[PDB]
Design a protein around this nucleic acid. Sequence first.
DNA 1: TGAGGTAGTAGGTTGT
RNA 2: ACAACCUACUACCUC
Length: 690
Amino acid sequence: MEAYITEMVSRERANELEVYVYVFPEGVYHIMRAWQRANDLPLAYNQHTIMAFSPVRHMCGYTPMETQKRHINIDSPFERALLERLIKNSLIFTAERHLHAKRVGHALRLNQVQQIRQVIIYEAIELYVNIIENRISIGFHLTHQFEYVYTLQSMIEQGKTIRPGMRVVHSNGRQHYTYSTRVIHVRTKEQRLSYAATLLKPLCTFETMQPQDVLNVSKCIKLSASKRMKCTYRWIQQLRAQYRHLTFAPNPFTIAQNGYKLDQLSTPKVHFHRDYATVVSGMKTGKLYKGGNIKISVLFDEDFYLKHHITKKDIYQFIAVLQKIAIAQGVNMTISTSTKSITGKFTDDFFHHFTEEVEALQPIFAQTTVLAFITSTHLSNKKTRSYQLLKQYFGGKWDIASQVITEKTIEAFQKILHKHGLKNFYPNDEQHCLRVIDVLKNESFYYTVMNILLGVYVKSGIQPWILANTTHSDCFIGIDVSHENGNSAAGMMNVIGSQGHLIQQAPLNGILAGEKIDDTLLANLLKQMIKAYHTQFQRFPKHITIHRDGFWREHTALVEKIMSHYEITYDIVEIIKKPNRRMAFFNSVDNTFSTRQGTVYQRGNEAFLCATNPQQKVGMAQPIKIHQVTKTLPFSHIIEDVYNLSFLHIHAMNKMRLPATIHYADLSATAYQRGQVMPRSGNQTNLPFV
DNA sequence: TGAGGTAGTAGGTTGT
RNA sequence: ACAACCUACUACCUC
Ligand SMILES: [Mn+2]
């Protein structure tokens, strides 16, 4: 029962390897390719330099200024990068020659494993080479690939037609690219290209597939953790059994062989009105931390009744059930009456004219949480696009928070009612509503009801829960940035309180004019965050923990310069969502890999955290990478804070994987990119999004 | 859009 | 030309 990482480390060292360096007076790409094809040898290059493992015989002309047999100069990034590319190319060459592998699209194609009804399922692997303090580390990740067995000629010969708008891909080595000797005019971008209608195939994306295949493709590519680890380790051992440029231990995969130390964090305690072990047991039979009064206005459409046999009495009794479930936990909702003046509106013609029939709707829906019951076919169809327009109007302009409920919830709720024969007049009946609540607590739809209620709460300023124990840091900042088309969006979080008290957003614009965040907005973020912290606590914070989504491209000097005025310590921790590695615990009693939530592998100032416990059907747990940049606090504290801050998912009763500072910053960035949110100033729980 | 998870597909994005 | 990422869209899964 030992910890395993999908990495290896070499017994050799960077400066203990002998290489050949050629120096010429981009640059030498064509020279390197010529030498590679002439001398069938692994080579690599950089700006004006070439490196190889063995001497080159057929020099193929040219005048290399210098030729040396030497070791690496480890104090230069150039040489370390060139050596990393050298080992990467050497491993690729070894895998291609002695193993039947191909370089297909950023990975290495392997032996076919499955084929179902004109769909070919391959196996792929990817390798990364790093130099970490005079040591050579190699990380490997396993994936799959999809293809169609038939090219265009076979389909034409079978008397099929090819649409001008098809998705076309050409299989030529690593280049890949997507778009009777027919001439095909393919539009990659702007100018057209011509091809002989051969070696061009339609894509095998999930979008363009057809049923009876997707249900099996998904079943095939979602395999257990044990299989995913065992196949990868088997192929890696086969590759290393015939590689001679580096050596490794008999079992290079355990964390002991790497520079990794094991830590195990523990589940925090949540506080509603006492100390609770879990959020689930706190929502069920438990009050709320900061309740209040909410007024909710209902939105209805005729199409939800014309197409689907649901009447407004069902919607209103559902709302009454929600209100009394809410009052069972210390919050009261009252139905607004401004919507009673307008009856029969929001017809299908209204949905085809959503733009010009919302100007007179603002006065009746103001100062309320607007529940919406629009039809999904209207929500998704491009002609109607009810969801996008509804959000961009309500939240985008009038700053009104809304929650959408589609049919599937409604008939799922009605099916159990019809099963037990409860369908009857159940309005303002305490016993009938009590038995409805009792029969709603015996199935998974209770979680749907609770998710809807939590969304309503957080949209109406209710603060569901907090952490029982204060974290090692006073307050947290969360940053996320998204790039779509030209413009970029920024999502921010100011978690005020060592337990989580103001999970509100940053009352600032996130629409970045430039490519990234400028220092001027970075200043204001923490400036008004500290001001809000003092406004809500009357005390300045001793330490502020910053979380960044991705890599910190901003300047380190600005944070120190602005936080030295108030004499506050900080951190610049980075969080990476795709580590491209796996974490496992192997059991020697019976060959099996498993995973345990709250596991940390640490080395220097870099750690791998396991924050989820997925089932076998879902797949395998996906680690998360923590890179602590600043040195102020002990790094065992930052990891624990990151793990603890991921239990403040006040919008759902499902365990979020990311911390609350980045998992909501992402949502804010998406809402700003599409325009479904506007800045709001206040001191309360403010999450207009989910 | 009840919410979350994970595993395919494609195209951006710095930065040396 | 490489690296690291990040994002979108579909898909099954559990609550
Ligand atoms: Mn929601």
